Subunit: 482 residues, 4 copies
């Protein structure tokens, strides 16, 4: 029971010395434990995630505290006090596997709720917005923010050339360059679904919805100087903090709140409600409390439960659906796809990914089939056994459409600057000074014409925002005020 | 259960019609069930086995009937009446996935015994010998007996050019060209370990051993004409027979018998006891009966239990070990290697491959890790927790060695023809004529110089053997006389 | 040079005998040539195709004979006498690698044209129609026509339960049960795109199109009895014929003809023009001649050129596009998905799949990257280098849409029987008798209620069609005439 | 030029906006550029190396300066002034992709020489020795020095529990805890083959050999405090240095020197000459200058040329071979094994891995076969076409052997401490204080019984070594005495 065996269950007699042809002779092929042990060792590693490769996870419990059942029939939300198992992974974005935790970056805020009608995956971020309006730009973002093909290092030129070429990116650039760019720990940041999603209620009415997760620990951040110091001591600071806190029974909590928009308002609101680079004003759609979750159990094995974790935005549950946010649409393809490659087609048989409700999922065979493959069950539908029966009671209402099939130009909406301006305007002088200093030092070494492209965008958001950065870089106002 | 869900447990509402932009419009990406179902479908297939790709499997039970505990300490054989669950896979060799069952070919006779001290895999054949003396020639044999690189069809010239270049191959060539080359069913053929292996007893004494599995149904074969007729009707004849026999409770049995040679005898016998192209004469080493098995249960799912089955000759149990047969030696590497590629590093977690005894196998991580991965258990040994403790009481005795590390030429042993001669001499005239006819027709269209090479080898086995084929082909006796 | 080396170019001295500790000792691990040779051998096999696994390929040339540039701007059709190289693969559907060539089945008719504006893949069939109207049924078809999960054999019950559950399948069921179900060779069958596609001209006007490939060798078929005799002798009959025909310089040819439907007609025609189970009457849309191709070159290596060939219906070229045929829509996802799994992400660097025109494809990294990965070229767009510039001149016209996003029920169109009834009406008494016999024998052993379901459908197509099978099965007319 | 196409060479019209059902409608599946672009993106990542994942590479040139042709027939050394092109990768050991360059760790020093008789791979380290005597302990070392299964962080307890269990590890622990544990740059460290290898001359005589690479830039190191400050600023410090140095034409250089031991001396020397934890004293075998290499080209693409680089210790060339060092013997299996998994079976067709000399490597098929697969060339040997002809002229002489096949206990050699003591004795008082300090801070938080185990080992090496650490930890000399 601490006794070593082979994978086939044979006792291992020799784990210290290989078999050789005499004391000083070469090694024998028939040391098969050596061959097995090293062959499994040689295959421990699987591909990292193409985005958010560096991260930390924990298990917890979501509890309903308020009634939103008029808007959604989702079983997770059905009764006050109702508890649901869940799993969260927090992460950086650009960093690879052993990259520093405490970098200036978006943080992933990824939740799996093990509901009675399926795993609901909400792969959120610590920001309500993102850089892009169209998912075609996503591989380009990755290539701009990660390592240069030649230098194998991040390139400020590549990063800023790309960002300055997409004025719609200004909102999230501002957020990442602000004081919230480096949370002090994963417990001291908020979470967001970011996208507009939808709620479907008992009567098949549709509402557009935003998910908000409010930290009960409050917001705490690190300056570039504090982060560099921390990173020099510990590339694993945020993992360390999450693990230690839960082991110390200091369980972090977040309050789920939602914004809910009747289907019809989408046609009338002054902002595109499906634009990922924009929020819905709280004045227009106030936050509505729903419940809270708390993270209260560390995984026993990081590789099995965290590295192998897969969150798919397409994994929704009755009462929760998508929206025509083009960014969300693209994500409906890319995650299942990336996860089948990264983890194997049968990766939902990995415990962390498995439903904790009845599952009868049809798909047969595939690599590493360990669940019995449904035994002798026939594989085709329609069939004379009524096997693999669809469930029409769960059918969503149609969605009205208007206009031709085409590549519609998102730049028809040129409101790239007002929401960033609003954000900047709300900052204290200290927060504005931090913003300015972070941006200016990030722009160091970046070719002047790219710098000026950014300063111009900041100016259009708010003249004080452009000027704050322009002054630090040594530009005359005339260079960026047109 | 009948109701259809996604892999994440979400009810599936539409399994008949995809989502489109209007009745006559193009398909929408947000049909996420379509993407999941097709993405899994697209990944059902895994690589087939490189050898013995076509096969049939069943479960059964082995029972000890005689006491051989004087020679082996293996728990499987420890008590008369002791029963052990097992899995068997029968197969052709050259045929791919949907190739005909009823071909002229060796048949695989592969057994997995779920013992209390590990899974014992014996991947045997329906013949006591093989074509080759050295494992380097194995890929060459595959390339000669399978599809030509250009034609994509088997090539008589490739096959016979290769066979005629290895005079040692004559024993197994004679067998495959004899009436035994096409068993009528898997139930009407014998099985053999083929290789010399070893038994180790309670006092750590070593014996060399051969395993023999004698069909209790007896031997039944098909002629080329009968097999062709059958194949034309049914490429699945042997699967159908095996499955149907078991479904009608006519369970096939085999009797295990062994030859046992004291270790010291191997230096004194007139033949090489580790030459896979040779048998041990029954006169020198009589068959010693051990027990019997029956196959009494069909797999519920063929892909998960038969296709994914992995038999590795290196999976031995205490009391059973290997020998210096170079062919056996090469197989100690190749199977685990082939199986990690074909099935994944964690394939021993697939139920058919899993031990039924205690397993504490050390290896961590790897693709599709579903077993918990030993949780938080440390991964290194030596350690201060007594974890992963080796088991020195199961240590095998040393093997004495003599001579330098070198590529010793097996052709020092030029006894290529005497055992084929003995086999031929024991055939009735009808069996000899069948041999002559099968060989002559197999050699059809093969260049004459290659045909002559084979006829010469046959003549050297027995003059009547060479002449029997020589006459059919129109050769003058002086052409192969010398 | 024919001298043997390692993969790293080191001379190999010993390819006949492995290195051992003495003449009769165990094998040494340091025989690294053995390890490398067997490790590569162990990895020769990749997954077969999930459908059409069994096949044959050849290179050839397409030549334009007629002017259709009024309808399409595609460069392949731009000038009379213009030659374009191509590769074709013909195949069965249900058979695995190694299954019989001469089975009753659809034949794949897959073409890759190496045009100056990209590879145009047309993955067609030897039939103008198919069994299904909706791509969700495809994995079900696979599972119904291939091996039973338990028996590992084809199942008449599974196949016919499935087909009788889909009355729309009757058209293709009729075709596959007719004398055309077994082509005598690949050269003696027609090819079809089957789907409605589109042509776009210089003025961006869209026409709907069907592609027809008319065999210049004529149609030749085999009966079940003739096919059985052939299979019994040769599982590779159609490969043998194609290879041998091309080596003998008897190059097979087909004439490309098209049906062309103005965009506005689609709304007015009495049949759904995007229904894969229906053809467009030649009376309404006569065949328009375009050109011809001949296959004149056998591949040098079958694995590298044929097995590794990837045909993706999404690989269209300017002037050729898709249609809202839901079956074609589903294919736009499945192939590239299946192919990246089967062949690797970078399979388009395999010579057979590579374009023979300017290519600058942007995708970076991925497994087995051999093309240089664009060197130091930056990887993001937009960028300040004008790199990865889109080509707006090649933009397609918008497609007009109407109606809500929904899973629209295709069974709104209940015209299941008229086109099968028409096809039957065109058959001679002899061809009808063959159809009746083929169907009755195919329904042998199938549960009576399933048989009756098919006969009922055949009855509704034409009373004589139903009665022909009904008689052979011993049914009274009252059992199926309602 | 600079224009975007699909992988099949079709021009891409829309790279900014995905195709939707109207301006604000959901995304259409038929946007096939989106699917292709995202599917390739989703598959960019391959597994990182199991050890030495973090690294930097460059191309250079080796020049022979002096004559050692008396001892080796290797072509690379055959003539003074002879130039050989090459590639080098330098690396850390424990860090993943993204981990800091400037950690306390062994550095990998890995060389590929493109010789006229094969690629000679020499995967060395920046140290002449290593922690272990037996290759079975390698996965244990990985699991001890990398991330704990539960915490996902490195563990001082795990690491030192393991190192203190292996007294033989002291030599390398001393070196990694010394000032040379953090090279300032890759240019400012030495390289070593570490293992005893062999040289074979024109007369087939064998010499044992050690390879040394002496930095022409000198040795320069960073203290823990200096390294932490650097890491806080830049995780890519060593990549940055190597890249910029070469771009600045400041080409780093190393002189190759060898130690050469006649075969006979191996039995007479007072140290095991095949013990990887030991050096050969310069007193007995002085360094003999051979040539130098410079690194003078940065790779064009890091992924394709550095990440995909594979160095296999078994890739030796005529004139150079192995030794019975158990650790070297194990590496002969593991690297090819790991690389086939990580990179694909055909990874030696990746340009950096490709030989420039004649290559005729035999192996057929396998994933991503892009080289032509030897076209129609037959695949078996022996054959009648002279194909795949072995090269017996390059045969190596036999190695005399003595003793039984057994798992021989290396702890028969109890000389664990003398060489670490010799090294300690040669350090200045300042470098000794640095050693004490690095070690004592490394032991922080490690259970006292483990700490004491290490101090005991150090004392055995030299009383002042043990006392130096003992003092800093607050132990009395009597607690770790003798
Ligand atoms: C929703 C409908 C369909 C789906 C999802 C589907 C799926 C597939 C898949 C996954 C493959 C293997 C691809 C590969 O690995 O390269 C394949 C092969 C093939 N299919 Fe389809 N199929 C569909 C309908 C059709 C139709 C309607 C046709 C004819 C018009 C067709 C013709 C072919 C041919 C010719 C091949 C073999 C291509 C080759 O020679 O490599 N399929 N199919
Ligand atoms: C039992 C002993 C050892 C085993 C089993 C082992 C195993 C491995 C493995 C699996 C890798 C990753 C290989 C790849 O994916 O390309 C690796 C990398 C490496 N190892 Fe070893 N190792 C051993 C000892 C050593 C020793 C003694 C040295 C130095 C003399 C060394 C130097 C290196 C270097 C430099 C690399 C990275 C090669 C590169 O730059 O791509 N290793 N090792
Ligand atoms: Cl994949
Ligand atoms: Cl592998």
């Amino acid at each position: 029971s601490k006794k070593l065996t082979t994978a086939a269950g044979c006792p291992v007699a020799h784990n210290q010395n290989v078999q050789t042809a005499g004391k000083r002779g070469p090694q024998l092929l028939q040391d098969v434990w050596f061959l097995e042990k090293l062959a499994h060792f040689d295959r421990e590693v699987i591909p990292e995630r193409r985005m958010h490769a560096k991260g930390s996870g924990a298990y917890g419990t979501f509890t309903v505290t308020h009634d939103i059942t008029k808007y959604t029939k989702a079983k997770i939300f059905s009764d006050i006090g109702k508890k649901t198992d869940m799993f969260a992974r927090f992460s950086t974005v650009a960093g690879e596997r052993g990259a520093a935790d405490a970098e200036r970056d978006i943080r992933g805020f990824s939740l799996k709720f093990y509901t009675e009608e399926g795993n609901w995956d909400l792969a959120g971020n610590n920001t309500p917005v993102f850089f892009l309006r169209d998912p075609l730009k996503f591989p380009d973002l990755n290539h701009a923010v990660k390592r240069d093909p030649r230098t194998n290092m991040r390139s400020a030129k590549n990063n800023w050339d790309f960002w300055t070429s997409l004025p719609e990116a200004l909102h999230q650039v501002t957020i990442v360059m602000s004081d919230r760019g480096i949370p002090a720990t994963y417990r001291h940041m908020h979470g967001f679904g970011s996208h507009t999603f939808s709620f479907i209620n008992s009567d098949n009415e549709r509402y557009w919805v935003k998910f908000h997760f409010v930290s009960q620990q409050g917001i705490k951040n690190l300056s570039d100087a504090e982060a560099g110091e921390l990173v020099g001591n510990d590339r694993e600071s945020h993992q360390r903090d999450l693990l230690d806190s839960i082991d110390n029974q200091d369980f972090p909590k977040w309050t789920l709140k939602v914004q809910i928009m009747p289907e019809a308002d989408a046609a009338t609101v002054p902002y595109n409600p499906f634009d990922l680079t924009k929020v819905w004003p709280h004045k227009d759609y106030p936050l509505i409390e729903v419940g809270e979750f708390e993270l209260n159990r560390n995984p026993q094995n990081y590789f099995a439960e965290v590295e192998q974790a897969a969150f798919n935005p397409a994994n929704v549950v009755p009462g929760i659906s998508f929206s025509p946010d083009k960014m969300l649409q693209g994500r409906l393809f890319a995650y299942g796809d990336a996860q089948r490659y990264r983890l194997g087609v049968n990766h939902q048989h990995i415990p962390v990914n498995a439903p904790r409700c009845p599952v009868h999922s049809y798909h047969r065979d595939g690599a590493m089939r360990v669940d019995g493959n449904f035994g002798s069950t026939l594989g085709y539908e329609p069939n004379d056994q009524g096997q693999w029966a669809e469930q029409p009671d769960f059918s969503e209402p149609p969605l009205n459409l208007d206009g031709a099939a085409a590549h519609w130009d998102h730049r028809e909406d040129e409101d790239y600057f007002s929401q960033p301006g609003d954000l900047f305007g709300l900052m204290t002088a200290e927060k504005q000074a931090i913003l300015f200093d972070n941006t200016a030092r990030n722009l160091n070494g970046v070719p002047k014409e790219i710098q000026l492209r950014h300063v111009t965008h900041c100016y259009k958001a708010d003249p004080a925002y452009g000027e704050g950065i322009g002054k630090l870089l040594g530009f005359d106002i005339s260079e960026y005020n047109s």
